[PDB]
Write a protein that binds this ligand. Structure first.
Ligand SMILES: C=C(C)[C@@H]1CC[C@]2(C(=O)O)CC[C@]3(C)[C@H](CC[C@@H]4[C@@]5(C)CC[C@H](OC(=O)CC(C)(C)C(=O)O)C(C)(C)[C@@H]5CC[C@]43C)[C@@H]12
Ligand SMILES: O=P(O)(O)O[C@H]1[C@H](OP(=O)(O)O)[C@@H](OP(=O)(O)O)[C@H](OP(=O)(O)O)[C@@H](OP(=O)(O)O)[C@H]1OP(=O)(O)O
Lengths: 102, 102, 102, 102, 102, 102
């Protein structure tokens, strides 16, 4: 479970940029008195998993063994037409070619 | 029915994330004077139902007994690109494959 | 007629939450100096008519006699991605097969 | 002409709902010093011509002589995705069959 | 070049309404200390060139010598769903027939 | 890497228009105490690479080394439906024909 303030309740806003949410995660973490390792691996597992399925999955899309910067860039394209454009095109064709999903 | 300020009146806004909604709900539940036995289940029954069909529908999808956490992670993903994007993936085949609905 | 401050000037913004629109509907109505009988049916005839061509459309879909609980929620489906989502599914699947309308 | 703050320079923000438009139209007309009768002949032609090419064209779409009630019925659904939707419903179905326009 | 605060640095936000952009243009212009003749010709060459390729192109579309009122009327349709709508419709059919561009 | 407040961290938000991004960038560049040569090229390497996948790739789209006016016009058009649309048409044309990508 994850209570307020605690990074365990820190989740990216679907509209919130990963560039922002990523920050909310680390600053909010400053709000928590977690052991540094408890705060870092948190910054790892809590960040990605709580990073707005869009960014969060993008992180996975980015191929694990990622750098915070990359997912920052891929998940940064989220919020502006970069998303509403690329995702739109991708979903637009996610189904065009892959419509049969099982 | 559900009068204002009561958890019964509590409802995830059409765009309100499961995360935010789950916050005003429980706070509202604090605002309500139902025992924990009456509140905790309101937290169960009212939450899923009042939680905005986007979340509410996911909620039923995850599978009865979905950890509040699971819906807490999925339902919340809704909002900006969260619903614009992911759903575009399903909205896209919702008409292409499922255009005929009966 | 229907000048401002009356329930005859109570409309749901297109993106407006039904729960919101309907909220001002009745506060305005409270201000509207009609009899219980002249105020209450407004709730019915003006709510459906002035409620966002989409919610207005939904209400008919909800099947008259419906408790405001259902129209409020279906209409609650409006605003967030839910509105674009449900509509995208029907209008998109309407313009595909039903593109021919006479 | 039409200088700022005069009903003449009163124009529905592209997105400014007609409801917002008609309220601000009436907020700047009321503000505008045109005879009581002039305001009446302003409230007529300026209202339809300045109300956002969408709410406006709608006012013209309802067929001149459209009770201000009908505009409010149609140009009220403007702004939300209900518009992006209802508009798409026709524009989307207008391009498929009517793409060739001369 | 065009330094900050100058009308040379004044550009319509990609989403910024022409009505808006044109307002700050002239407000900012006053800030710029250009001779009346210099401000008047900036008002013309900088207004169109720095007016958001949507409006900026519209202005040209309106055809040179276009009255500020026409740019204001055509570039005002830019911003909300009024645009996304009109533009999507043309772009949509542009790619249908005109997809081949050379 | 690029720490907080540095022009290195500095990035065109997804909604931050290039004309604005470039505005906080330069203000933020002044904030980081660097030599002229340093700021001279920071303004370059950090302005295009941190430049919002849309504006940034636009710069590269225009052709790197592009005049600030070329990236500015091109990126000052990135923000609203002038963009969310111009792109929707193209990305749409990217997945219609070019959906197959390898
Ligand atoms: C690919 C598809 C399957 C379909 C096939 C063709 C299509 C159709 O007929 O369905 C043409 C219309 C489009 C392109 C939809 C896709 C969806 C989009 C969208 C609903 C997408 C989300 C966008 O909003 C944002 O990005 C958020 C934003 C408003 C900028 C903010 O921050 O406030 C908005 C602008 C609302 C559009 C309007 C155009 C349409 C309907 C297309
Ligand atoms: O007017 P608000 O209630 O504050 O809503 C705004 C508005 O969106 P709409 O087009 O739906 O009216 C913004 O647009 P502008 O007012 O600047 O035109 C938009 O941002 P964009 O300009 O980037 O499209 C932003 O949406 P978001 O930041 O989610 O993309 C959204 O704010 P909220 O939904 O957060 O209220």
């Amino acid at each position: 479970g994850g209570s307020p303030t605690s990074i365990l309740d820190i989740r990216q806003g679907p509209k919130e940029p990963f560039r922002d949410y990523v920050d909310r995660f680390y600053k909010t973490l400053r709000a928590e008195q977690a052991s540094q390792e408890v705060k870092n691996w948190m910054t790892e597992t809590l960040l990605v998993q709580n990073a707005n399925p869009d960014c969060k999955t993008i992180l996975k899309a980015l191929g694990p063994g990622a750098t915070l910067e990359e997912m920052m860039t891929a998940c940064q394209g989220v919020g502006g037409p970069g998303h509403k454009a690329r995702v739109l095109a991708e979903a637009m064709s996610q189904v065009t070619n892959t419509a049969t999903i099982m």
